[PDB]
Design a protein around this ligand. Structure first.
Ligand code: FAD
Ligand code: FAD
Ligand code: 4FW
Ligand code: 4FW
Ligand code: MG
Ligand code: MG
Lengths: 414, 413
């Protein structure tokens, strides 16, 4: 009828990888696989574009570290995707305050296990001043570091494992790379392997409902053009983020794990120009962290620039775009001049610009934790980056995927 | 403030026409006007794509008649759009039954006085057999004509308004045109002109609910990337179809009119080929109406063919499309073969192909004005469906004009 042996929902690097680690196994010879995804394209939070012709840009994930993420490096080589050196690993145009970061936080780790699980702003604020702790943090660029849920021990892990301000640790042993053609090439590689082993894709359809009926599961999905449809599958993987799980009839997260989950929004805007004006300032392949609302400002070669914000600042910029595209472009050039110490009529307007916003850009856990969850009752398997040590990286996907593969192949064998 | 004087929800031809009329009035000189649409692109049911390399295909509204659509033709001329002749006005292959039916149709006409609001199916069941009735009613290629909510009165009118079957009625004199750069070319022209007047477009935002708060209104929209959004406006038109209206919190249909509304699904599939393999059979600019699922097969010059289906037979193809692309492409050359009376293998595989399904492609009119008003809250609604041209984009064009004027009623009140 309209059915399958195994069903994976979600075609991010997680669910896509789940499928490969399953077709790989003979325990699955003959069994049919069907994969759904809301988007019409595969890759989830991995989306790569070509910016009005020209070159390839990265609206989602953009870099990896062979040191931090060893499995992602093997998936790159496995599907033979060329990497390139990621340029934005430290700071030339350091202001006054982003020179004291290293001397401070190196000697600002006496109470890492003496104060403890305190929120991270009220930790750094108990030894330097507050009107001087809001200055040291805001000069690191990530506004994730001002929040109640994230803690002081959670917040130093974010400093050391992000390329632009890891030099504020013993963490320059980390090299950083980006995909030469975009991570889209990795996703297309996996997608090809899985179609070839005979899985069947159904992109465009979004899952709304699951009932258990007997041996398997009955899913209610809504294509993106109104068409509803149902799928019965005997085994079911829900490789989607934890914000996605709440949307469903599946007791999330009580039935899966005694944990709570959070999320932060992210925003990126890209700008290309007729003449590549920013070279007169020796700003090739470099990055400026600023107090103004742009926050992080990146200059890729002589081809485009872009900026990257989070939390409240992400929600700041989704606000300007709502009131009007021109108001948006006029405000970032105001802030661009502010940042270069120049007048706003020295800053050209762009030809082409694009921009994406992620309502749940990064999903994480509070506070142990297995790499994949299961329903205590119905044995649905849930796979996501958020359930792993590396909540928030592609490595989290690859780990949760290898896991959920074996949890499901168990549910099959014997 | 995310505030505005006037706010049009919907950027189909209706909504963009309300915008055009208001911005041409001085009772709106220096009044703010924002237009929302959940889509990422204006047009609504008018969507034009380039298929393959140099084929302009019309996935939504396709053709118009200077006889039945004078306001559309004016609009196309007003905006320097050029339109070509629509070739699909004759059946070169009238079948036994679809030869014996111009005559069969004429005779029953005065039995529309006798009993005229029956099923069009029930209606023909009387003159001929229920069996002889169905083969006649099916040879016209619009399965909507089997639904019971379609009276024998409007049946005769739907037949007469369509270019492939109008010879069966005494509308055989109507001419037909299609835009050549695609009807999007018109939509773009209005968009561009309503921009230059200073309206402001927030596209990719979807109205979820609306609350009255005294003077004006408070709209809660959700961006397509998840961003929630509140917007405050003084005057509100909802240039959205009925089915869209049922979705929102505003009481509809009851706070608005007596009538209830219905809709049909529509399907359209297109295929281009390596060489134009239908020219040997003399089929360019022909249209065959068959009794198999394809239903209406069109052959456009030497550029592509397509088919066009509705009601039950639309859901049949949205179904076979979901059960994998592979057999869809294969049921089609199967059925292309029967229609031609050739063996399956003389029909080549296609290189490109695109298809579209509209869940509510036609919305209709089942004692009725051009543009609705809320009894209590007095917000304005306008769509093709509130008109004598339900299902036609002339219905949009004039519902919009009544609606626009119905609002400036509110500007001096
Ligand atoms: C701006 C940004 C930058 C990033 N930079 C980096 C980086 O440099 N390095 C790094 O390692 N990681 C980075 N990441 C994170 C990385 O992209 C993610 O961790 C990873 O892609 C998540 O993969 P996933 O397979 O768990 O699911 P996702 O990639 O989140 O995809 C989930 C899929 O499930 C689908 N889905 C959801 N819900 C439903 C439903 N009800 N029915 C059907 N389908 C559904 C979604 O469409 C999606 O396709 C970044 C993320 C963002 C937003
Ligand atoms: C396959 C097909 C063929 C057709 N052929 C013809 C033809 O040959 N001749 C002819 O005259 N007509 C034809 N039509 C119909 C014609 O397109 C419509 O009658 C006309 O476009 C009506 O458009 P509209 O302005 O009423 O709004 P629509 O085009 O119906 O759409 C209005 C807009 O409002 C948006 N919208 C809706 N709801 C909400 C919400 N809750 N929040 C925000 N935004 C929203 C919609 O997304 C849409 O963009 C055809 C239609 C179809 C489907
Ligand atoms: N996309 C980021 C990862 C990131 C950005 N902000 C936060 C906050 C908390 C945890 C995180 F993993 C992140 C990057 O790849 O640079
Ligand atoms: N504009 C459509 C009309 C259409 C097609 N099927 C039906 C059924 C009922 C009413 C209708 F107005 C229609 C067209 O020309 O295709
Ligand atoms: Mg995934
Ligand atoms: Mg409209």
């Amino acid at each position: 009828k309209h059915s399958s042996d195994i069903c994976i929902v979600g075609a991010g690097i997680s669910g896509l990888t789940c499928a490969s680690h399953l077709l790989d196994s003979p325990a699955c010879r003959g069994l049919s696989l069907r994969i759904f995804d809301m988007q019409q394209e595969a890759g989830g939070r991995i989306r790569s574009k070509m910016l009005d012709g020209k070159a390839s840009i990265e609206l989602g994930a953009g870099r990896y570290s062979p040191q931090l993420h060893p499995h992602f490096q093997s998936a790159m080589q496995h599907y033979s995707q060329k990497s390139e050196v990621y340029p934005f690993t430290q700071l030339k145009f350091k202001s006054h305050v982003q020179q004291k970061l290293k001397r401070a936080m190196n000697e600002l780790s006496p109470r890492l296990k003496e104060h403890g699980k305190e929120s991270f702003l009220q930790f750094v604020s108990r030894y330097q001043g507050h009107d001087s702790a809001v200055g040291m943090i805001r000069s690191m660029g990530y506004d994730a570091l001002f929040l109640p849920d994230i803690s002081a021990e959670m917040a130093y892990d974010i400093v050391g494992k992000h390329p632009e301000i890891q030099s504020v640790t013993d963490n320059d042993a980390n090299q950083w790379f980006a995909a030469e053609t975009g991570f889209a090439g990795l996703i297309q590689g996996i997608k090809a392997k899985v179609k070839a082993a005979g899985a069947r894709f159904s992109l465009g359809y979004r899952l709304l409902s699951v009932r258990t009926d007997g041996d398997g599961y009955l899913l209610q999905l809504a294509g993106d053009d109104g068409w509803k449809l149902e799928h019965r599958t005997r085994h079911l993987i829900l490789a989607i983020p934890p914000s996605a799980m709440a949307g469903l009839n599946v007791d999330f997260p009580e039935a899966w794990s005694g944990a709570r989950y959070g999320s932060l929004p992210l925003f990126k805007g890209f700008l290309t120009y007729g003449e590549p004006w920013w070279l007169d300032y020796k700003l090739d392949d470099q990055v400026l962290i600023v107090d103004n609302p742009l926050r992080k400002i990146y200059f890729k070669g002589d081809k485009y620039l872009f900026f990257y914000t989070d939390s409240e600042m992400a929600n700041y910029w989704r606000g300007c775009v709502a009131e009007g595209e021109d108001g948006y472009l006029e405000q970032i050039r105001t802030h661009l001049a502010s940042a270069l110490g120049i007048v706003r009529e020295r800053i050209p307007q762009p030809l082409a610009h694009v921009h994406k916003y992620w309502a749940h850009g990064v999903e994480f856990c509070r506070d142990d934790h297995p790499s994949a969850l299961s329903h205590r009752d119905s044995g649905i398997i849930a796979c996501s980056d958020a359930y792993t040590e590396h909540c928030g990286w592609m490595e989290g996907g690859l780990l949760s995927a290898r896991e959920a593969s074996r949890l499901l192949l168990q549910r099959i064998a014997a």
